[PDB]
Structure 1
């Protein structure tokens, strides 16, 4: 049983304090990867297209819970020609996954107000309302990662480019989708220079959508559509604390 470490970073400008969120990252690693990983997070925060931070934290801590290893979701890339086509597709896919249309519309009305949320919003498909009480902080999924070497192999097989963005997103989405209360996830970047997003779920897998907004805009989105009776805090604790490594099995081909 190898010991793993959670390594987290966040960065902002104009303070920590009301600042603009610039970058966030999370990694899960053995101890001999610490120097490289702390540097990868530092650099990710310092070279961000949302601007240069005046505040950054980086932390590591031993994880005591035993690590679980899962397969990435099956990926499909939907090529679209503009953001409106993408968004419409996204809403079709959410519906097919099981989110009712009226819940989807209600959430889409609120997505603009959630632009500044630094993690994810949790949206209850029973009440048709936001379920977490974290406000601008959002719920930040942590303690997931995907050893690069296995990711590069996966991307080669999948005919998807071996970009860090995709490794991070797919690791997140896979951890999130595994959770029995999560029906679906809608995501696109708050970076001005990346317009691909996705909808994920247990059935459809990870459905990339190649245009979800316009170049140059900084309004991203991360919403988890939740179907659960249980207390939201239990779900939040799972998302924040349950350690996941992604390992794609070439062999299962």
Structure 2
């Protein structure tokens, strides 16, 4: 018996925190305490506890690597390069980078979710270009174990969280992903795919840029199944 525990929190109408845990009932309360304690300041928080019907367990298997650069132009140049090692045409990879740096939300600011980009044509397939699509209903099978292991190998808690999210994306049929943070202080981003692994890349923006986002590279012929998988299928990831 599994329960999905989803938390989001706002402050001054702005989203400041959000997380999901999928656990056995005997750790339900523990998961709720953790997420309730997650944001520092908030004026509104919602928590959803949902009994899980079906779910799938999947074995994590991406290679991790790390790269440092001396300007965002050089980090984005490398980012485009790694993307074309997943068979993506260079101009498609470049338009992704172009969209994130110039503001992915057409009415200014960050999106509430990821761009779905046609691998072949670079065109944005998400219907709501302010909202995008959100990957949800994923968690590490044994998050306590995974967090301690990755911390001691030198990865941060943001790495722990982003890894589980990409791996679901790739399992759901996203070919490749580009991501850097919306938070102007954090400036590591990544690029991922089944062949290039999980590729951490610093810095993909200047420390002070408030723009970020994610671009998912998807084959249009699979768009409907991909969206269903990202947003509805329940996946536990086993390290």
The two structures share one fold, judged by TM-score above 0.5: yes
After TM superposition, list the pairs within 5 Å mapping 1:22-33 onto structure 2.
Answer: 22-33=16-27
Please give the per-residue CA displacement for 1:174-215, whole angstroms capped at 9, x wherever unaligned.
1111223x2110011112321111000010010011322122
**Equivalence for 1:197:** 189
Instruction: Name the SS for the 2:168 alignment partner.
Output: helix
Instruction: Name the SS for the 2:98 alignment partner.
Output: helix
Instruction: Name the SS for the 1:102 alignment partner.
Output: helix
Do the aligned residues in 2 keep the contact of 1:145 with 1:244 (CA within 8 Å)? Answer: yes
After TM superposition, list the pairs within 5 Å mapping 1:143-162 onto structure 2.
Answer: 143-146=137-140, 147-152=142-147, 154-155=149-150, 159-161=153-155
**Equivalence for 2:5:** 7
**Equivalence for 2:158:** 165
**Equivalence for 2:126:** 132
Do the aligned residues in 1 keep the contact of 2:179 with 2:213 (CA within 8 Å)? Answer: yes
**Structure 1 pair 128/156, CA: closer, same or farther in 2 (3 Å)?**
closer
Do the aligned residues in 2 keep the contact of 1:6 with 1:63 (CA within 8 Å)? Answer: yes
**Structure 1 pair 234/134, CA: closer, same or farther in 2 (3 Å)?**
farther
**Structure 1 pair 233/57, CA: closer, same or farther in 2 (3 Å)?**
farther
**Cα distance in 2, alignment partners of residues 169 and 31 from structure 1:** 25
Do the aligned residues in 1 keep the contact of 2:183 with 2:212 (CA within 8 Å)? Answer: yes
Please give the per-residue CA displacement for 1:38-62, whole angstroms capped at 9, x wherever unaligned.
2322332x22xxxx43222111101
**Cα distance in 1, alignment partners of residues 46 and 185 from structure 2:** 24
**Cα distance in 2, alignment partners of residues 102 and 226 from structure 1:** 15
Instruction: Name the SS for the 2:190 alignment partner.
Output: strand
After TM superposition, list the pairs within 5 Å mapping 1:1-253 onto structure 2.
Answer: 3-15=1-13, 20-44=14-38, 46-47=39-40, 52-111=41-100, 112-114=102-104, 115-146=109-140, 147-152=142-147, 154-155=149-150, 159-161=153-155, 163-180=156-173, 182-230=174-222, 232-248=223-239
The 10-residue stretch of structure 1 (203-212 or 132-141) with the greater mean CA deviation from structure 2? 132-141
The alpha-carbon deviation at position 140 of structure 1 amounts to 1.1
**Cα distance in 2, alignment partners of residues 137 and 29 from structure 1:** 28
Which consecutive unaligned segments of at least 5 residues does structure 1 have?
Answer: 249-253
* TM score, norm. by length of structure 1: 0.84
Please give the per-residue CA displacement for 1:117-136, whole angstroms capped at 9, x wherever unaligned.
11211111233211111332
**Cα distance in 1, alignment partners of residues 5 and 67 from structure 2:** 33
Do the aligned residues in 2 keep the contact of 1:72 with 1:171 (CA within 8 Å)? Answer: no
Do the aligned residues in 1 keep the contact of 2:7 with 2:45 (CA within 8 Å)? Answer: yes
Do the aligned residues in 2 keep the contact of 1:139 with 1:236 (CA within 8 Å)? Answer: yes
